[PDB]
Structure 1
């Protein structure tokens, strides 16, 4: 991973980041035993492979908020730690790979269109979808699951349209057996994210969107630990007489 960032810009960034932390230490009169604890915790985070976790939960939202200012299309949200490139392709109407366990869950039938800013539909458009099972696990991050469980790259039709069936997602708890969970327990916080779908939406000559969709009335939307929920990204699915949840959502892409 490489970035074009000047010595100048890094210097200014570092200056107020360090300045900022240092001022927090001065403000609260952080002590030597606390500095000790903070230092051990930083070590434990890395030793626990939790940098992607801690940073995406606690910091990434700021980074998207930056990106957000330059974009007129569908609201984005954080990627999170669990995205895997090249999930196998599916046709514009499809059902996500899933186990027999998953088939037991209320289906969710997610329809819509990928359009440009003027509302025109786009051919060659892809919706990469991923989310957790009802147990709270993500495939390839849980050894029991098939590697593409609840993951696919949906090939939208010539109109930019898709109809994707999956399971209704459930509120999800971040891992709490390690230093991120410790950091949350020590301050009486909670480790919950709302029920969500993760998506990256793309089309030839367009700027992709990495986003998340949430469910109206769902638990923790007002208190997402990752601070990644936006009012515009909340779905209101209607129940069918087949008992499936139905919802239509359109994506609106900026030009690249």
Structure 2
């Protein structure tokens, strides 16, 4: 039951700008009646396909985080995306993310670092909620065949704010091509792809949490993210060990609540 405290005055100004802007694009490009019928049917399709969270997060949410970005001094944020789930099972500072026997076959990714405040003091009782896709680009709880907490966890950072999280390296994400979001994209010759990414919500007692994503230097779609959610500050350059595992360190800087 979602709410916001927006005064009628504010909404009216937003509505005026949003609707005026759309209406101007129509006048600009000479949007015809047949094209208008196509837009109306496609908005119906979007909701009938359950793709409002998907369409909105891909095309709109980057600007919402960009707003929040201004008011923030810590680690760069990025969009949540639609694939977040609360209360993923807790795990200790040093852990391995829950995975299938399939996932065990993929080159491992060892993610290390520390949660700290703005001055660099480590934070006790910090939490790292991590979620990402498997090598097949699917999310648990958004794929029937997967264990419901595959590659999802609540990492409990130690008394010093540190974690050593062993996972696999995520595959790039492709947005279902079959639906209206993918229809919108195929019809303009765009591409339905996101670079490979880790999702992280990072919290601490008395701190303003951070929702962020982490990408990979080599990675494809790196310079053409369809959700426009990539920032260079969030690109990891993992180095590979003689065990053949990929090793990366990244620290989280939380703002005060």
In the alignment, structure 1 segments of 5+ residues that lack a partner are none
Rounded Cα–Cα distance in structure 2 between residues aligned with 1:229 and 1:77? 7
How far did 1:117 drift?
A: 0.1
How far did 1:170 drift?
A: 1.5
Query: TM-score with structure 1 length normalisation?
Result: 1.00
How far did 1:138 drift?
A: 0.0
Rounded Cα–Cα distance in structure 1 between residues aligned with 2:136 and 2:214? 19
* Deviations, residues 101-136 of structure 1 (Å, cap 9, x unaligned): 000000000000000000000001000000000001
SS at match of 1:94: strand
In the alignment, which residue of structure 2 is the partner of 1:170? 171
How far did 1:68 drift?
A: 0.2
SS at match of 2:118: coil
SS at match of 1:100: coil
In the alignment, which residue of structure 2 is the partner of 1:47? 48
Query: TM-score with structure 2 length normalisation?
Result: 0.99
How far did 1:164 drift?
A: 0.1
How far did 1:248 drift?
A: 0.3
Rounded Cα–Cα distance in structure 2 between residues aligned with 1:101 and 1:172? 18
Rounded Cα–Cα distance in structure 2 between residues aligned with 1:63 and 1:176? 25
How far did 1:158 drift?
A: 0.3
In the alignment, structure 2 segments of 5+ residues that lack a partner are none
Rounded Cα–Cα distance in structure 2 between residues aligned with 1:26 and 1:187? 20
Rounded Cα–Cα distance in structure 1 between residues aligned with 2:171 and 2:250? 19
Rounded Cα–Cα distance in structure 2 between residues aligned with 1:252 and 1:144? 36
In the alignment, which residue of structure 2 is the partner of 1:93? 94
SS at match of 1:152: strand
How far did 1:251 drift?
A: 0.2
Rounded Cα–Cα distance in structure 2 between residues aligned with 1:161 and 1:177? 42
Rounded Cα–Cα distance in structure 2 between residues aligned with 1:203 and 1:80? 22
SS at match of 1:40: helix
The root-mean-square deviation of aligned C-alpha atoms, in Å, is 0.4
User: After alignment, is 94-103 or 172-181 more displaced?
Assistant: 172-181
How far did 1:74 drift?
A: 0.1
Rounded Cα–Cα distance in structure 1 between residues aligned with 2:196 and 2:176? 15
Structure 1 residue runs of 4 or more that deviate by more than 4 Å after TM superposition: none
Rounded Cα–Cα distance in structure 2 between residues aligned with 1:148 and 1:68? 29
How far did 1:177 drift?
A: 1.1
In the alignment, which residue of structure 2 is the partner of 1:184? 185
How far did 1:175 drift?
A: 1.1
In the alignment, which residue of structure 2 is the partner of 1:225? 226
How far did 1:57 drift?
A: 0.2
How far did 1:91 drift?
A: 0.2
How far did 1:254 drift?
A: 0.2
* Deviations, residues 139-174 of structure 1 (Å, cap 9, x unaligned): 000000000000000000000000000001111111
Rounded Cα–Cα distance in structure 1 between residues aligned with 2:143 and 2:30? 42
SS at match of 1:169: coil
Rounded Cα–Cα distance in structure 2 between residues aligned with 1:229 and 1:235? 12
How far did 1:31 drift?
A: 0.2
State how 1:58-97 maps to structure 2 within 5 Å: 58-97=59-98
Aligned pairs, number: 256
